[PDB]
From Swiss-Prot:
Major subcellular location class: nucleus
PTM comment: Phosphorylation does not directly affect casein kinase 2 activity, but may contribute to its regulation by forming binding sites for interacting proteins and/or targeting it to different compartments.
Organism: Homo sapiens (Human)
UniProt GO MF annotations: ATP binding; Hsp90 protein binding; identical protein binding; kinase activity; protein serine kinase activity; protein serine/threonine kinase activity
Range of the intact protein held here: 2 to 331 of 391
Positions bound to ATP: 44-52, 67
Active site, UniProt feature: 155 (proton acceptor)
Protein name (record): Casein kinase II subunit alpha
Interaction with beta subunit, as annotated region: 35-40
BP GO terms, sorted: apoptotic process; chaperone-mediated protein folding; DNA damage response; double-strand break repair; negative regulation of apoptotic signaling pathway; negative regulation of double-strand break repair via homologous recombination; negative regulation of proteasomal ubiquitin-dependent protein catabolic process; negative regulation of signal transduction by p53 class mediator
Length: 330
């Protein structure tokens, strides 16, 4: 018959037990700040269609970033706003400083705190072993928090992690694909970015949960400790799953498909072939060896699992010995 149902193994009913207005974002009444408090300074690079700007709050001369939204997507705008408000003040979550609009045209915009980011393409080349452990821990604080608040981020990738490296200051940004978790809901699998899509998205398993974000995090960890960005580089979504299978092996993939009674698109079996699981040690070479340890490999192995229920939760990840020296520091 159809696929086996699944529910999250942590934070399952957080939204069930909240007041409706916590998660019923279409009902939210937006409290608007004053557009004339902000002046746009320079456009930032956020992709071809983005409208994201460095700006200044002219009442205090603090730098901010403004994201101008397209008003056509009313329900999606309210969802992002409600999620940002629900999570504001949480650890390592970007702060929504304001929400403003043109008073006449009503074009709305989100105003974020400024982080003095170093582009990850440059930054990740310079990070030490300790730095990777530290910033992974910071991202885990943000994911445990938002998952505990009933929210899946669904677009975890380096481009959505702002790092002010000299202040060791990290923020998880771009909550525009984030969604409230409700057990049994069949979600859109056209989320995340190709290289960070979990197997559930690539095989069209819609009843996914917070654990999708842990697969994306494991992709980032692998790219950082092995200096291979992105780590799984498919040319489309089908080839993306082949790239994962050439590392994790095809047997555990077919085991996952069988466990959830997933109907695999039939061209897949041709291109997936037959691949053994590769020992993680195989990806260590001369330029990344100083970033790899037995603890890092054990931790990565526990995030990058086909079965979403078998991946570490963010809190379980924070307990892993990979972070022992970070935890003492904090
Ligand atoms: O879509 C969003 O949620 C969102 C949120 C924040 C930012 C954001 O981007 C920055 C970029 Cl790209 C460069 C630099 Cl140097 C600083 C920032 C920054 O301070 C900042 O807040 C972008 C998009
Ligand atoms: Cl969805
Ligand atoms: Cl979690």
């Amino acid at each position: 018959s159809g696929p086996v149902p699944s529910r999250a193994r942590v934070y399952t009913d957080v939204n069930t037990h909240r007041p409706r207005e916590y998660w019923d974002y279409e009902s939210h009444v937006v409290e608007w700040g004053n557009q004339d408090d902000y002046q746009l300074v320079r456009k930032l690079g956020r992709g071809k269609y983005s409208e994201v700007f460095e700006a200044i709050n002219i009442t205090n001369n603090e730098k901010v970033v403004v994201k101008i939204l397209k008003p056509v997507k009313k329900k999606k705008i309210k969802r992002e706003i409600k999620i940002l408000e629900n999570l504001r003040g949480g650890p390592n979550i970007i702060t929504l400083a304001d929400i403003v609009k043109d008073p006449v045209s009503r074009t709305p915009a989100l105003v974020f705190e400024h982080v003095n980011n170093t582009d990850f393409k440059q930054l990740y080349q310079t990070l030490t072993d300790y730095d990777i452990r530290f910033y992974m821990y910071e991202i885990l604080k943000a994911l445990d928090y938002c998952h505990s608040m009933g929210i899946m981020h669904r677009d975890v990738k380096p481009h959505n992690v702002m790092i002010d490296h000299e202040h060791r200051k990290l923020r998880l940004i771009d909550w525009g694909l984030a969604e409230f978790y409700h057990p049994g809901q069949e979600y859109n699998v056209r989320v995340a970015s190709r290289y960070f899509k979990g197997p559930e998205l690539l095989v069209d398993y819609q009843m996914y949960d917070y654990s999708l974000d842990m697969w994306s995090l494991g992709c980032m960890l692998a790219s950082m400790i092995f200096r291979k960005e992105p780590f799984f580089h498919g040319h489309d979504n089908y080839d993306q799953l082949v790239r994962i299978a050439k590392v994790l092996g095809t047997e555990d993939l077919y085991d996952y498909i069988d466990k959830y009674n997933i109907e695999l698109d039939p061209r897949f079996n041709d291109i997936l072939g037959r691949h053994s699981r590769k020992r993680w040690e195989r990806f260590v070479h001369s330029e990344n060896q100083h970033l790899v340890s037995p603890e890092a490999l054990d931790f990565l192995d526990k995030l990058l699992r086909y079965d979403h229920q078998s991946r570490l939760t963010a809190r379980e990840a924070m307990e892993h010995p990979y972070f022992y020296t970070v935890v003492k520091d904090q």
